[PDB]
Design a protein around this nucleic acid. Structure first.
Ligand SMILES: [Mg+2]
Ligand SMILES: [Mg+2]
Ligand SMILES: [Mg+2]
Ligand SMILES: [Mg+2]
Ligand SMILES: [Mg+2]
Ligand SMILES: [Mg+2]
Ligand SMILES: [Mg+2]
Ligand SMILES: [Mg+2]
Ligand SMILES: [Mg+2]
Ligand SMILES: [Mg+2]
Ligand SMILES: [Mg+2]
Ligand SMILES: [Zn+2]
Lengths: 118, 108, 148, 308, 152, 287
RNA sequence: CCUACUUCACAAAGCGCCUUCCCCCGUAAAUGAUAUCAUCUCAACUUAGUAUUAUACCCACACACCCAAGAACAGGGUU
RNA sequence: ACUGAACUCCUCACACCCAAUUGGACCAAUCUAUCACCCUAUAGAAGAACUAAUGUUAGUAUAAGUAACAUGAAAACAUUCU
């Protein structure tokens, strides 16, 4: 589900990935949103690549990294899986997801005047 | 431009022991079934060619003795005959070059 | 340097301390000159200290040659077969005494870099860590995202 | 003696057997080619109708040469002759394995000797039941246009007025200096110039202390694949399988060119009237004339054009 | 670029190339067998064939006579060309010469060739002979030939 | 068990080998003169009944060793590994001689024998296979044949293409093993003792002992496989390069037992055939 | 790229001929709260608004001679 | 909170981290005295120690098997031809 990552703040629009093709005029700067639309794995791959130690083992390590844009995973990879790591960020619930019991449990904060359009 | 640093023996070995520089093994060498000599497939057997060249040189020395002078190329065919050979019917009217040795087996 | 030198692991000869301690030095051979200032200290050692050392170390056979070759020496042969030759050239009596005692207390193993200051044949009692220690199991051993 | 001797088919054949083998193998080749002459009677794959967005297969033709041509407006167009020589579909691969998301048809042409091909290629063509082809080119197609491997293709697979793209290896000019390769101005002939008339000038600036990748430098020119887009098909000789393509085509005479429907946007949906899967002579719906002409072509034999 | 260039660049130029080939051809006409660097023999083979054709054209043909006069530096060979070589090949239409590769020249290791006019009086060259028809492969192929002849 | 049969046959083979070697002890220098066209007049002094035409080739050069397939010792074809007996004239025959007919026949017999080994060690244990004979067919016939009687449990079974390809793969495994062709001139008595079980081989041995003046028979072994040879064989199995078991035709007149003729075709390293020519030869080797 | 023309001549060239395909964003609007009007919105939201270049190109594991391939090597052809 | 030095503590040991300069303890090899007579000792001496002077001489590398150089042709090796 690397396609469904979430960026805090306006990083989708502000974070810029810079590359150079080597040729003159070959400097390419692409926002995170554009890079994500192009490759749904690039953002996570680049984050991991930047966090890994900058030595010759880094690409051997990156060979052990398997990124899949969506829920689908190859059968052999699935059979290899051993453990699932807890998600680092707990996803906040939406109102549509809150139960009526929970809504009721939360107190009403204020008395709205009756004569108000709302 | 002059070299900026002496090239090490390690670099030099990597260069001058490259396969591109190594001599390639030839695989077109075989044995001449006639005489059993080594030859390349597309080239004439060296030994057989040497035989033919020596015999040709002897025949040409005889031709030169017969002609006796520059610019004496005959206007008629030539036939080489060895000891114990006689001009055949078709050998008539052709200059005869006589060789003192016997007819070589490879010469027909 | 370590990279330019051989290295070994800490070890004893035959588990030298488990059942009993066996002195690994078994032979000392002192080649000493009757004449020559180089072996004056060795001569004094033979006169004043070799007998006491011998009776202190009954397991070590000590030979005194009184006819050296190229320098006065002490050759120490250990049970494991190692032979350590030390020149006693121009050494005082006390220097020779300390050197001989060092040879006596030392084992035949090479004096090279020792990789670890410790050596356990049984490093683990509770079980060496493997990735599955501390990992909980799941019902029917179902791997993550497994349908059944 | 080491055992890596390089052998050719004739090496151990006797004088009597050489001509016999030549004749036998040539007869087999022509028999195999004839066996495929009737594809529609050989379990043809479903022939779907044309739909918008459908891409059909192309051909592999041989550049015969060039000749002039005149249009009814009186203008002369140089046209190049592309002969389809034993062009057949050889292989079909699906979107998944096409290295993309569009089916692929391999097409070969210009049958060549079997004595000069690698064992793997010979086995592939033996399974296909065809003599080996000089070049195999891959065409991206939609599944609508899939054609059973082994089916022949003909010049009439195209039609006059169509626009086509022709890709081929350009003429190889070897290592060429910068003046000929990139059209550099060079340096003056006289006025003092010493030993610099055709040389590259400065190759970079002093600051970067290197040469940028992609700098134009002397090197091998030509002998690379180039495509000419949007060439009009002026005429088709069905008898000899000749396509008359407007203008110039890359590569030398007698070189194999890959010919396909033009990809230019202006000609996006002109495939309505073209034979969608391919032209099937075996279909025999209407035996085509010997020459199909575009409307504007001044056909030879017509009365002399008068601009009345 | 030398696309379609059929003539080697030899000697000191075009005239020198013609003269070199002319000397080789005169030697060939005189001796009926010549050793020379492979490339020069290859270049001169076409000229040798053309001379045989010109000699076939006839002694009385002025153009053939002029061509022979130019191409044979020793003029005693012109009667030979018009009265020995041309009559010898009157039956044939081509392939008057036989060119074979020879072991590289010892001097400079040059690729060497021997070119002869077919039918000369000299001892035959050790020509390459194909495998005997009685070999295993050739017999199997003869079996194929007989079976094909019978079946079809 | 078949393994025990092979073991005991090999034991008898080695016993006869040692017996003949002992019968010929010490070293008696026999003069063998090279009468071949090339290197004429050379003489090899050789160890009687120990040295071989292969040893003479080794003396001559490596080209002779690699190219020589048979020997005409005193005008008779001798296997390159068959010990020389008496002073003689020797000439080495290759595959490319002007008249290689003898070499072709020897190659044909050796290929048939290899096929026989493959056949006998191919089928599953339960089925029983009886190697009747290697009929002597001309090379023009296009395929060397080996006759075998399979079990009644298989008389209704015809090999599939995959079975035939497995036979070819086994033959190529044998070629890769490159086992020398061992020979023995063995009297009919010991030959019959070795082949007591195989009735077909017993009667063939009787036929051969009748044909020849004495009761001397030609036994040949590649490895663990011993068979009666109609004549001299190839030195080694690596001489074969292209080898294919092409077909199995059931002989029409089979009332008592069903004789299946395994047909195959081979070409040596010296005479490799291009892929297409080989395919045509394969096609014609299925008749 | 060579059909013509021209330099030329079994071919290389231009002075000759042939082919060349989507955009980028500054603003202008819709509904609408904070601030019940209004408000294009670093409010939620709806358009102009699109790069996520579209493609095309290339894709056959395994002597000698000739070549439009080529410095060598490599490449293609030899049915 | 933790991390964090050659700081400090800890076990053991301590003369053992500046330029110029200065003080000092040792010392390779050589020769001499006298020893030793084995390859050393105590002394007296001195052409008494070389990773460095575009150092001197010699050797051999690198550049590099590179730049460069050379034989008109055939032939009967007589000769002829260009
Ligand atoms: Mg200019
Ligand atoms: Mg100039
Ligand atoms: Mg030159
Ligand atoms: Mg710390
Ligand atoms: Mg401190
Ligand atoms: Mg000094
Ligand atoms: Mg020094
Ligand atoms: Mg110096
Ligand atoms: Mg050098
Ligand atoms: Mg250089
Ligand atoms: Mg040079
Ligand atoms: Zn020869």
């Amino acid at each position: 589900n690397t396609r469904h990552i979430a960026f805090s703040g306006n990083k989708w629009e502000q974070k810029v990935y810079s590359s150079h093709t080597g040729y003159p005029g070959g400097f390419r700067q692409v926002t995170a949103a554009q890079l994500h639309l192009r490759d749904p794995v690039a953002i996570v791959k680049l984050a991991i690549y930047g966090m890994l130690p900058k030595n010759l083992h880094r690409r051997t390590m990156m060979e052990r990294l398997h990124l899949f844009p969506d829920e689908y995973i190859p059968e052999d990879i699935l059979k290899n899986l051993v453990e699932e790591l807890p998600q680092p960020r707990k996803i906040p619930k939406r109102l549509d997801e809150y139960t009526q019991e929970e809504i009721d449990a939360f107190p009403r904060l204020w008395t709205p005047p009756e004569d108000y359009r709302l | 431009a002059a070299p900026k640093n002496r090239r090490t023996i390690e670099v030099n070995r990597c260069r001058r022991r490259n396969p591109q520089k190594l001599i390639k093994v030839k695989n077109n060498i075989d044995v001449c079934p006639e005489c059993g000599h080594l030859k390349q497939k597309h080239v004439l057997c060296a030994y057989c060619y040497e035989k033919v060249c020596k015999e040709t040189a002897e025949i040409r020395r005889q031709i030169g003795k017969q002609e006796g002078g520059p610019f004496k190329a005959p206007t008629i065919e030539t036939v080489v005959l060895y000891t114990g050979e006689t001009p055949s019917e078709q050998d008539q009217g052709k200059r005869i070059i006589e060789r003192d040795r016997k007819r070589p087996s490879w010469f027909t | 340097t370590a990279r330019g030198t051989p290295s070994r692991f800490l070890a004893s000869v035959l588990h030298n301390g488990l059942g009993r301690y066996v002195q690994q030095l078994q032979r000392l051979s002192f080649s000493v000159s009757r004449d020559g200032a180089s072996s004056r200290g060795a001569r004094e050692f033979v006169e004043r200290e070799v007998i006491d050392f011998a009776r202190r170390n009954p397991g070590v056979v000590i030979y005194v040659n009184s006819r050296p070759c190229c320098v006065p020496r002490v050759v120490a042969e250990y049970l494991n077969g190692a032979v350590r030759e030390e020149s006693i050239h121009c050494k005082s009596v006390e220097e020779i005494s300390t050197l001989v005692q060092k040879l006596a207390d030392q084992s035949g193993l090479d004096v090279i870099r020792i990789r670890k200051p410790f050596h356990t044949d049984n490093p683990s009692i509770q079980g060496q860590w493997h990735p599955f220690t501390n990992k909980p199991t799941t019902f029917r051993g179902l791997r993550p995202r497994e349908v059944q | 003696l080491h055992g890596k001797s390089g052998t050719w088919w004739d090496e151990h054949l006797s004088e009597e057997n050489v001509p016999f083998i030549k004749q036998l193998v040539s007869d087999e080749d022509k028999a195999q080619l004839a066996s495929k002459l009737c594809p529609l009677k050989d379990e043809p794959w479903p022939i779907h109708p044309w739909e918008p967005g459908s891409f059909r297969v192309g051909l592999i033709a041989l550049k015969l040469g060039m000749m002039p041509l005149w249009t009814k407006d009186g203008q002369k167009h140089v046209v190049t002759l592309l002969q389809v020589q034993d062009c057949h579909v050889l292989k079909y691969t699906s979107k998944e394995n096409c290295n993309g998301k569009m089916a692929t048809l391999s097409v070969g042409g210009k049958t060549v000797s079997r004595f000069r091909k690698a064992t793997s290629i010979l086995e592939f063509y033996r399974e296909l039941g065809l003599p080996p082809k000089q070049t195999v080119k891959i065409f991206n197609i939609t599944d609508n246009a899939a054609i059973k491997p082994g089916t022949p293709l003909y010049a009439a697979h195209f039609r006059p007025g169509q626009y086509v793209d022709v890709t081929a290896k350009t003429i190889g000019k070897g290592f060429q200096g910068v003046m000929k390769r990139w059209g550099f101005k060079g340096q003056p002939a006289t006025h003092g110039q010493t030993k610099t008339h055709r040389r590259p000038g400065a190759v970079a600036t002093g600051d970067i202390g290197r040469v940028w990748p992609g700098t134009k430098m002397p090197g091998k020119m030509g002998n690379i694949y180039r495509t000419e887009y949007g060439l009009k098909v002026w005429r088709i000789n069905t008898k000899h399988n000749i396509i008359y393509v407007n203008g110039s085509v890359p590569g030398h005479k007698n070189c194999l060119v890959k010919v396909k429907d033009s990809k230019l946007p202006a000609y996006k949906d002109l495939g309505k009237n073209l034979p969608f899967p391919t032209y099937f002579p075996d279909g025999d719906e209407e035996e085509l004339p010997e020459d199909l002409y575009d409307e504007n072509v001044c056909q030879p034999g017509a009365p002399s054009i008068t601009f009345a | 670029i030398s696309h379609g260039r059929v003539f080697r660049r030899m000697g000191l130029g075009p005239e020198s190339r013609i003269h070199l080939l002319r000397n080789l051809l005169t030697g060939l006409v005189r001796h009926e067998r010549i050793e020379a660097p492979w490339a020069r023999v290859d270049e001169m083979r076409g000229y040798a064939e053309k001379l045989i054709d010109y000699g076939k054209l006839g002694d009385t043909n002025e153009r053939a006579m002029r061509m022979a006069d130019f191409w044979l530096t020793e003029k005693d060979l012109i009667p030979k060309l018009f009265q020995v070589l041309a009559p010898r090949y009157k039956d044939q239409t081509g392939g008057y010469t036989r060119m074979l590769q020879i072991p590289n020249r010892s001097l400079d290791r040059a690729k060497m060739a021997v070119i002869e006019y077919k039918g000369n009086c000299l001892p035959p060259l050790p020509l390459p002979r194909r495998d005997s028809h009685l070999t295993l492969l050739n017999q199997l192929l003869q079996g194929l030939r007989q079976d094909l002849r019978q079946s079809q | 068990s078949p393994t025990e049969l092979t073991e005991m046959r090999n034991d008898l083979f080695n016993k006869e080998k040692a017996r003949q070697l002992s019968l010929t002890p010490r070293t008696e220098k026999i003069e063998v003169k090279h009468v071949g066209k090339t290197d004429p007049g050379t003489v090899f002094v050789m160890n009687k009944n120990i040295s071989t035409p292969y040893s003479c080739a080794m003396h001559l050069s490596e080209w002779y060793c690699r190219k020589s397939i048979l020997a005409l010792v005193d005008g008779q074809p001798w296997d390159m590994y068959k010990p020389l007996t008496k002073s003689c004239e020797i000439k080495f025959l290759t595959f490319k001689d002007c008249d290689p007919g003898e070499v072709n026949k020897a190659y044909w017999r050796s290929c048939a024998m290899m096929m026989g080994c493959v056949i006998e060690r191919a089928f599953k244990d339960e089925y029983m296979v009886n190697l009747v004979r290697a009929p002597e067919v001309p090379v023009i016939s296009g395929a060397f044949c080996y006759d075998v009687v399979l079990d009644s449990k298989l008389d209704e079974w015809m090999p599939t293409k995959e079975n035939l390809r497995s036979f070819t793969k086994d033959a190529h495994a044998l070629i890769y093993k490159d086992l020398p062709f061992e020979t023995l001139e063995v009297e009919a008595k010991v030959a019959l003792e070795i082949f007591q079980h195989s009735k077909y081989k017993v009667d063939f041995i009787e036929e051969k002992a009748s044909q020849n003046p004495e009761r001397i028979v030609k036994l040949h072994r590649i490895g663990d496989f011993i068979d009666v040879s109609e004549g001299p064989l190839i030195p080694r199995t690596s001489i074969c390069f292209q080898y294919e078991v092409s077909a199995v035709h059931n002989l029409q007149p089979t009332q008592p037992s069903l004789i299946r003729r395994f047909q195959g075709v081979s070409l040596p390293v010296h005479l490799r055939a291009h892929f297409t020519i080989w395919d045509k030869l394969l096609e014609r080797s299925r008749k």
